[PDB]
Amino acid sequence: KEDLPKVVVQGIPEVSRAVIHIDEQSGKEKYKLLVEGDNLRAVMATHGVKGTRTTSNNTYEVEKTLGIEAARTTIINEIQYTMVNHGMSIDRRHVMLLSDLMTYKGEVLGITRFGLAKMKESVLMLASFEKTADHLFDAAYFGQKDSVC
Amino acid sequence: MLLFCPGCGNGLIVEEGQRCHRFACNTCPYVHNITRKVTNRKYPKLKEVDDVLG
Amino acid sequence: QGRFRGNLSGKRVDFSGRTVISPDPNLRIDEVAVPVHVAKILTFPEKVNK
Amino acid sequence: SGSMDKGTLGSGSKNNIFYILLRDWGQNEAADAMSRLARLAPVYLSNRGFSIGIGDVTPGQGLLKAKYELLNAGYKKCDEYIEALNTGKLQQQPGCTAE
Amino acid sequence: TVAVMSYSGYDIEDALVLNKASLDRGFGRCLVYKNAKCTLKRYTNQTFDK
Amino acid sequence: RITTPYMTKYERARVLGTRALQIAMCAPVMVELEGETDPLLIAMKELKARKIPIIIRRYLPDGSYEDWGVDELIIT
Amino acid sequence: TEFFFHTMAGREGLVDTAVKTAETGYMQRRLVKSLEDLCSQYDLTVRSSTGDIIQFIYGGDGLDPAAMEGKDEPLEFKRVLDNIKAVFPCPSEPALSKNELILTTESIMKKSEFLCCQDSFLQEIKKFIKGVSEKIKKTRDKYGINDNGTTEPRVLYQLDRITPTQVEKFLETCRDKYMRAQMEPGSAVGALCAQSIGE
Amino acid sequence: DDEEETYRLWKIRKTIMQLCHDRGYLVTQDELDQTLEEFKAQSGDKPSEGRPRRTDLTVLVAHNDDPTDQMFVFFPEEPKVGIKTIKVYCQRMQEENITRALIVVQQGMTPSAKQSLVDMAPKYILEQFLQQELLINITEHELVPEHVVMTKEEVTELLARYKLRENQLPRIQAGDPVARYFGIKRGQVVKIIRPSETAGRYITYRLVQ
Ligand SMILES: [Zn+2]
């Protein structure tokens, strides 16, 4: 009696809310779906949805669904849109370089300590950024020789 | 729904007896057989039609 | 205040000063005014040549 | 033709005269032009005189009349909307509640 | 007696121009008083700071 | 021969600095300075005259290298 | 009450800026510490410290964002053409027609100094030349200007006046700007990107 | 049902045909441009349509490389494929002497079945594919650029022009959706043509690792 009312009958479990947005272009008024969910594959797989022109904000879902290049393009577009919302403009080359550096190992690696360690190899830089003692002891254990490049 | 025994006042579970389902208390021999239909509606709020914002 | 952030990445240096700023439009954009008092303290090593 | 402003002499965006000088004739020409501007504009601005007083911000009679009329109209419309929502049914805009 | 106006372009951003004669006649003249304290204490042994 | 023929600002800066240091270390002048007591001014004069005896050794990432003369490169 | 509400808004903005300062400081620190390794090599390939390539060419084209005259474009052909027409007005040379303009453009572009230039920039130059030539053709058709150069009212030639000298000057200026606007090897592009994204 | 299921089946068949054409296998133009009416003519109802056998494909052969090479496509009927079904498919491929096969599951693959499929045999190459992913072609997506698997000669020419090594090229995981779509292995290189804002294109390369 407490769980039965919350059993799904139709729709994607991950999708929480979907709304019908409308663009009122002078030529024609078109309709699109704005879904506040975290499942792009299910949205594209649903009937009547043009999966070829479906984007998303979560970079991880785009990476896992449409590849690494799709994730790079989504990151670039999202950063450009977020920067334009505030009226300030940035050259696309900077965001392109950022996205490439984030997507040059085949996986979207963040700028946090974890992604920075997964990308970089110098021991001194990792020890200086964060987790000094941990990284230093790990390097001493592995005996990893660090170059001066 | 929630019902209480007039004897002690504890919650009444529903159990299958020897003749018919009955309300019963877990701390006393008090029981109450069901004669007619008993219903407890909740009337959930449904989903509404939401509109075409934009 | 560690060694990496406090003594390796960013560290204090000499031959430097800190002073308040004031406007002066009579100077070029690539020029900056220095007071005589600070100028007498910050020295530059010039090598004696021909 | 035209009068100089932030859109042409400011640091807002492209189309700046100093930017065109920098991109067409090098850095030295732009620096010299900026120095000449910084040395000329103050002298003229001081010889002409530019001041602000309380009379430069005081409202006019027509301005006060228009402000009063606009405030009256807005308060009337707000009271009408309040009465419509509290007593009766108010047109609910899409994508949001009545409040 | 302040006059709101632009003069000599030395008041571009929040700066102000002062009159030399005003400062010469005592305007804005200020005084800074500092304290220098010293202690001559007696130690455990029968000796004192002199 | 495949790199850009224009001399970058970093190359300009490093060449001027090295030449100024050399001139400050009693190096010979090849432009006949006229009352220039600042070594950096003499280095800039030598650069504008294209008489700096320094050859840039541009290294490729793989390891290959190529020599370019200051007088051979293009200045701005 | 109005003064109290204004003070509330002011303190809200103050606390917003106070939080923004530290937040953006931390973000800038992280971005710079992460992007301080990349650099532009001499082979036009952006590589990391370990030698791995992040991009075969910076920005896909290899242009300096600091030397970007147009809106994410290397040059504004209209402004450059106007500046060339104004700085070098040749009164002793006749105007050029559509066919003559296209011919001189094709003859000048096929030189050796233009071979090393990127193909996209040459295609954009060709497109702009075709556009201005179509504009000149439309003007001459509206005002019946003859390409032979014997029209009685000479002022009609002042509507859209172009001379081969100005065409050559425009092409040379565009080529020089495109060559001087490329990424200079050795520049710390990663640090510049980090700073331009943090500020 | 009986209307959306057949539509999903037709779309999955069209996506599989497009994938086989992209990989270089032999597929006629009729199979590529297959309307829903033809699929209905073949089978217009769910019970009439046979997922495990009526939808299987065995004519897929790499005409560009070698006609003898054969590739197979499976469509398990059960939602979750077990070990017995994988063994049956493996022994069927052995009988038919097929080395490359595809499995289009309906809901998913059990962990044990996945681990077994991973280490079936170096010669028997089987790739897992969910029907939910195949309902939309990844190549036709606007965000996904154009990818082309380069031959060894092109890779050698690239390494000679840039004087690079294999490990120095950008990496791309083998589990990438596009990687599994093209079925590229470790060591192969893919050229990617990103459409720029202008009329030009940006050519890049990625190594599978
Ligand atoms: Zn009871």
Swiss-Prot record, chain A:
Component of the RNA polymerase III (Pol III) (Pol III) complex consisting of 17 subunits: a ten-subunit catalytic core composed of POLR3A/RPC1, POLR3B/RPC2, POLR1C/RPAC1, POLR1D/RPAC2, POLR3K/RPC10, POLR2E/RPABC1, POLR2F/RPABC2, POLR2H/RPABC3, POLR2K/RPABC4 and POLR2L/RPABC5; a mobile stalk composed of two subunits POLR3H/RPC8 and CRCP/RPC9, protruding from the core and functioning primarily in transcription initiation; and additional subunits homologous to general transcription factors of the RNA polymerase II machinery, POLR3C/RPC3-POLR3F/RPC6-POLR3G/RPC7 heterotrimer required for transcription initiation and POLR3D/RPC4-POLR3E/RPC5 heterodimer involved in both transcription initiation and termination. Expressed in the brain, in the cortex and the white matter (at protein level). The lineage of its organism: Eukaryota, Metazoa, Chordata, Craniata, Vertebrata. DNA template strand binds at R113, K131. Disulfide bonds: none annotated. Coiled coil: none annotated. It comes from Homo sapiens. This is DNA-directed RNA polymerase III subunit RPC1.
Curated annotation (Swiss-Prot), chain F:
Component of the RNA polymerase I (Pol I), RNA polymerase II (Pol II) and RNA polymerase III (Pol III) complexes consisting of at least 13, 12 and 17 subunits, respectively. Pol I complex consists of a ten-subunit catalytic core composed of POLR1A/RPA1, POLR1B/RPA2, POLR1C/RPAC1, POLR1D/RPAC2, POLR1H/RPA12, POLR2E/RPABC1, POLR2F/RPABC2, POLR2H/RPABC3, POLR2K/RPABC4 and POLR2L/RPABC5; a mobile stalk subunit POLR1F/RPA43 protruding from the core and additional subunits homologous to general transcription factors POLR1E/RPA49 and POLR1G/RPA34. This is DNA-directed RNA polymerases I, II, and III subunit RPABC2. Signal peptide: none annotated. It is found in: Nucleus; Nucleus, Nucleolus. It comes from the Eukaryota. Keywords: Acetylation, DNA-directed RNA polymerase, Nucleus, Phosphoprotein, Transcription. DNA-dependent RNA polymerase catalyzes the transcription of DNA into RNA using the four ribonucleoside triphosphates as substrates. Common component of RNA polymerases I, II, and III which synthesize ribosomal RNA precursors, mRNA precursors and many functional non-coding RNAs, and small RNAs, such as 5S rRNA and tRNAs, respectively. Pol II is the central component of the basal RNA polymerase II transcription machinery. Pols are composed of mobile elements that move relative to each other. The keyword Transcription applies. The chain holds residues 51 to 126 of 127 of the full protein. It comes from Homo sapiens.
Curated annotation (Swiss-Prot), chain G:
Residues 1-40 are annotated as: Bridging helix. Expressed in the brain, in the cortex and the white matter (at protein level). Changing G59R: In WDRTS; uncertain significance. It is found in: Nucleus; Cytoplasm, Cytosol. Component of the RNA polymerase III (Pol III) (Pol III) complex consisting of 17 subunits: a ten-subunit catalytic core composed of POLR3A/RPC1, POLR3B/RPC2, POLR1C/RPAC1, POLR1D/RPAC2, POLR3K/RPC10, POLR2E/RPABC1, POLR2F/RPABC2, POLR2H/RPABC3, POLR2K/RPABC4 and POLR2L/RPABC5; a mobile stalk composed of two subunits POLR3H/RPC8 and CRCP/RPC9, protruding from the core and functioning primarily in transcription initiation; and additional subunits homologous to general transcription factors of the RNA polymerase II machinery, POLR3C/RPC3-POLR3F/RPC6-POLR3G/RPC7 heterotrimer required for transcription initiation and POLR3D/RPC4-POLR3E/RPC5 heterodimer involved in both transcription initiation and termination. Belongs to the RNA polymerase beta' chain family. This is DNA-directed RNA polymerase III subunit RPC1. It comes from Homo sapiens (Human). The gene is POLR3A. The chain holds residues 845 to 1043 of 1390 of the full protein.
From Swiss-Prot, chain H:
Component of the RNA polymerase I (Pol I), RNA polymerase II (Pol II) and RNA polymerase III (Pol III) complexes consisting of at least 13, 12 and 17 subunits, respectively. Pol I complex consists of a ten-subunit catalytic core composed of POLR1A/RPA1, POLR1B/RPA2, POLR1C/RPAC1, POLR1D/RPAC2, POLR1H/RPA12, POLR2E/RPABC1, POLR2F/RPABC2, POLR2H/RPABC3, POLR2K/RPABC4 and POLR2L/RPABC5; a mobile stalk subunit POLR1F/RPA43 protruding from the core and additional subunits homologous to general transcription factors POLR1E/RPA49 and POLR1G/RPA34. Transmembrane segments: none annotated. InterPro entries: Arch_Rpo5/euc_Rpb5, RNA_pol_Rpb5_N, RNA_pol_Rpb5_N_sf, RNA_pol_subH/Rpb5_C, RNA_pol_subH/Rpb5_CS, RPB5-like_sf. Keywords: Acetylation, DNA-directed RNA polymerase, Host-virus interaction, Isopeptide bond, Nucleus, Transcription, Ubl conjugation. GO terms for molecular function: DNA binding; DNA-directed RNA polymerase activity. GO terms for cellular component: cytosol; nucleoplasm; nucleus; RNA polymerase I complex; RNA polymerase II, core complex; RNA polymerase III complex; RPAP3/R2TP/prefoldin-like complex. Belongs to the archaeal Rpo5/eukaryotic RPB5 RNA polymerase subunit family. NCBIfam families: PRK09570.1. Pfam families: RNA_pol_Rpb5_C (PF01191), RNA_pol_Rpb5_N (PF03871). PANTHER family: DNA-DIRECTED RNA POLYMERASES I, II, AND III SUBUNIT RPABC1 (PTHR10535:SF0). The keyword Plastid does not apply. The keyword Cytoplasm does not apply. There is a cross-link at K80 (Glycyl lysine isopeptide (Lys-Gly) (interchain with G-Cter in SUMO2)). Disulfide bonds: none annotated. Its main location: nucleus. It is found in: Nucleus; Nucleus, Nucleolus.
